[PDB]
């Protein structure tokens, strides 16, 4: 088998859908956007709350629209705002609600199909705030850490705020030239290990300035992209798609990808890269 087999097709969804909702490709009725990962959208209507649970599946939430909701992790709440990269770690209590006036929508991504082929699905229901909102900020997210922290699997940061993260990308355009494949791209980091925010999924935020025509890249990580702002086209080895704000597309293994933008576009992505790099199977080609 020279070169990676498909396992997943290129795929586009224009954020004119419902408006929970699964997104799947060439894996019809497998509930999975990739062969490894799951993606879908989720709505919480005003007043709704959810009970708190825990499972081995890892999960990220990237907020699409709506303010006044919150997600809690292990007793701590964090406000969800547009573009926030919220995580709920793999064996930590989580729940949410909005006592607000706005429907709130987000992108969920979980490694359900991967945990399912590894055989490692466990889940339990809670039988308790105790944790001031905003705690994780100074405790883990200003380049310093408590003396006796101790964790294994982590990222005590469960909200990579957009206002922060977007700002990074913008400050970087004053400081150098864009990379010709990816624009101004950065990976979200676990400040305890320098590693991935979560063990199975890696996550990225990238800016592609107006008028950008990057080159062709391939990676082994089938990749779920999400347009947080901006617009233009993408080419996914051959197939082309037009994208506008809040669309979502998937780039399968070894499919060349390129971007041609007509606005300053900020793309969010995630994939099983960490699992690949852990085994020594990640591979990249810029051409």
Residues in region 171-200 near a second copy by CB under 8 A: 171-172, 174-176, 182, 185-195, 199-200
CA nearest to 40, candidates 60, 25, 55, 20: 20
Are residues 186 and 178 in contact, defined by beta-carbon separation less than 8 angstroms? no
Q: What residue has token string 């080895």?
A: 237
Q: How far apart are alpha carbons 75 and 129 in whole angstroms?
A: 4
Residue with smaller CB distance to a second copy, 154 or 258 = 154
Torsion of CA 162, 167, 173, 178, to 10 degrees: -30
Residue with smaller CB distance to a second copy, 102 or 179 = 179
165 binds a second copy (CB under 8 A): yes
Beta bridge partners of 60: 87, 109
Residue with smaller CB distance to a second copy, 43 or 186 = 186
Altogether, the residues listed in the chain come to a count of 287
CA nearest to 24, candidates 12, 42, 15, 14: 12
127 binds a second copy (CB under 8 A): no
Residue 115 phi, psi dihedral angles, 5° rounding: -70, -25
Size of the site for a second copy (CB under 8 A): 86
Scanning residues 228 to 287, which ones bind a second copy (CB under 8 A)? Answer: 252-254, 272, 275-276, 278-283
Scanning residues 81 to 100, which ones bind a second copy (CB under 8 A)? Answer: 90-91
Site string for a second copy, 32-71 (x = CB under 8 A): ---xx------------------xx---------------
Binding test (CB under 8 A) with a second copy, winner from 26, 45, 101, 124 = 124
Stretch that binds a second copy, among 15-23, 101-109, 117-125, 258-266 (CB under 8 A): 117-125
Are residues 142 and 136 in contact, defined by beta-carbon separation less than 8 angstroms? no
Residue 53 counted as an annotated binding residue:
yes
| 3-state DSSP assignment of residue 115 | helix
Q: Least distance to a second copy from the beta carbon of 18, Å?
A: 25
Residue 55 counted as an annotated binding residue:
yes
DSSP code of residue 108: E
Residue with smaller CB distance to a second copy, 173 or 233 = 173
Residue with smaller CB distance to a second copy, 18 or 125 = 125
Residue 170 phi, psi dihedral angles, 5° rounding: -70, -35
Residue 170 counted as an annotated binding residue:
no
Binding test (CB under 8 A) with a second copy, winner from 26, 49, 120, 213 = 120
CA nearest to 70, candidates 97, 103, 43, 108: 97
Residue with smaller CB distance to a second copy, 20 or 279 = 279
18 binds a second copy (CB under 8 A): no
Residue with smaller CB distance to a second copy, 79 or 100 = 79
Scanning residues 131 to 150, which ones bind a second copy (CB under 8 A)? Answer: 131-132, 134-135, 137-139, 141-147
Buried/exposed code over 204-231 (b: 16+ C-beta within 10 A; e: otherwise): bbbbbeeebebeebbbbbbbbbbbbbbb
Residue ranges for the known binding site for Fe(3+) are 53, 55, 94
């Amino acid at each position: 088998p020279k070169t990676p087999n498909a396992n997943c097709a290129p795929a586009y969804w224009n954020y004119q859908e419902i408006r929970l909702v699964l997104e799947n490709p060439a894996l019809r009725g497998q509930s999975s956007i990739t062969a490894t990962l799951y993606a879908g959208l989720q709505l919480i209507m005003p007043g709704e709350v959810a009970p708190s649970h825990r499972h081995n599946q890892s999960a990220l939430r990237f907020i699409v629209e709506g303010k006044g909701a919150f997600t809690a992790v292990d007793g701590e709440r964090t406000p969800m705002n547009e573009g926030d990269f919220i995580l709920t770690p793999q064996w930590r209590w989580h729940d949410h609600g909005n006592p607000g006036d706005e429907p709130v929508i987000w992108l969920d991504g979980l490694d359900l199909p991967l945990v399912n082929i590894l055989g490692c699905g466990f889940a339990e229901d809670y039988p308790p705030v105790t944790r001031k909102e905003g705690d994780y900020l100074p405790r883990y997210a200003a380049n310093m850490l408590p003396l006796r922290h101790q964790t294994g699997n982590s990222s005590p940061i469960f909200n990579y705020r957009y206002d922060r993260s977007r700002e990074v990308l913008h400050d970087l355009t004053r400081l150098g030239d864009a990379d010709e494949w990816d624009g101004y791209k950065m990976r979200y980091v676990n400040p305890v290990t320098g590693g991935y925010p979560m063990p199975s999924m890696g996550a990225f935020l990238q800016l592609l300035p107006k008028g950008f025509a990057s080159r062709v890249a391939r990676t082994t990580d089938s990749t779920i992209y999400h347009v947080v702002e901006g617009s233009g086209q993408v080419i996914i080895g051959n197939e082309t798609f037009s994208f506008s704000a809040k669309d979502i597309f998937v780039v399968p293994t070894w499919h060349g990808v390129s971007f041609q933008t007509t606005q300053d576009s900020v793309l969010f992505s995630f994939s099983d890269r960490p699992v690949q790099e852990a085994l020594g199977l990640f591979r990249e080609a810029r051409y």
